[PDB]
Amino acid sequence: ELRVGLEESELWLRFKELTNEMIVTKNGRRMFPVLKVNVSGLDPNAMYSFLLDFVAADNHRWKYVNGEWVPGGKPEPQAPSCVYIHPDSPNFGAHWMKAPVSFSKVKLTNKLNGGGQIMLNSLHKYEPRIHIVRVGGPQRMITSHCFPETQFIAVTAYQNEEITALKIKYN
Ligand SMILES: C[C@H](N)c1ccc(NC(=O)C2CC2)cc1
Numbered sequence: 001e002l003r004v005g006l007e008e009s010e011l012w013l014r015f016k017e018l019t020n021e022m023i024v025t026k027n028g029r030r031m032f033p034v035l036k037v038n039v040s041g042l043d044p045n046a047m048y049s050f051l052l053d054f055v056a057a058d059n060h061r062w063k064y065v066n067g068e069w070v071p072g073g074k075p076e077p078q079a080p081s082c083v084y085i086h087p088d089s090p091n092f093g094a095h096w097m098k099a100p101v102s103f104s105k106v107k108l109t110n111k112l113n114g115g116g117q118i119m120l121n122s123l124h125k126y127e128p129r130i131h132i133v134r135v136g137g138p139q140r141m142i143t144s145h146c147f148p149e150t151q152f153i154a155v156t157a158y159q160n161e162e163i164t165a166l167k168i169k170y171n
Contacts, residue, residue: 002132004145007036007100011170012149018162019069020152022126028107028117032171035128035150036100042093047136049089050096052103054081054118054126057151062123064159081126082118090135101130108154120154127151 006012011033012020023029035052042048056078060071084106088095109117120126128150134141158164 002041002143003039004130004132004143005038006147006149007038007102008033009149012147015163015166016149016151018160018166020150021155021158021160021163022108022120022152023158024108024110024120024122024154024156026109026111026113028109028113030104030107032167033150035103035106035130035147037130037145038100039096039132042097042132044092044094044097046093046134047090048093048096049091049133049135050086050101051089051131051133052084052086052106052118053129053131054120055129055146056080056121057125057127060125062125062153067160069153069159078121078124081120083131084116084118096132110154110156122154122156125151125153 015033022031058071059075059078061074062069062071084103086101086103087105107117109119110122112119128147130145132143
């Protein structure tokens with residue numbers, strides 16, 4: 001059975017309980033914390049690519065109002081984010097299972113850009129999600145996993161200084 005787990009969930013939970021925020025820039029900003037995933041139950045010899053995308057957790061614009069995040073009242077449908085391919089892709093099960101799969105090179109942007117960078121809507125709430133795609137083999141297969149622990153609001157600058165402080169404390 002394919003098992004997918006979150007490395008350093010303790011740290012993600014500190015950020016989540018304060019409402020996590022991730023900086024987006026026109027050029028694209030790397031994430032802190034980094035999404036790291038423990039994976040077991042892959043065929044060491046089978047071929048897989050690791051994909052990352054960001055689900056709009058709700059259809060609302062959020063705003064920091066008197067030290068608290070509150071949603072607008074005018075939802076719009078949220079077009080899904082683009083997919084980031086882990087640069088080790090494609091690779092053997094053994095490669096993916098020898099150490100946590102670490103998405104340290106994904107960059108979050110607010111502007112449609114060349115490639116690499118994933119465009120998010122500023123002040124929308126996102127839930128990171130991976131797809132483990134079995135490639136090359138006869139039978140293509142996809143397994144998807146969500147990480148509620150790693151939810152955040154995309155911001156152009158931090159609103160909650162509690163978040164600013166946690167980021168610096170642990171980077
Ligand atoms: C060059 C770069 N490492 C790269 C580019 C495309 C893919 N395509 C896939 O694996 C798709 C089937 C899921 C993988 C890696």
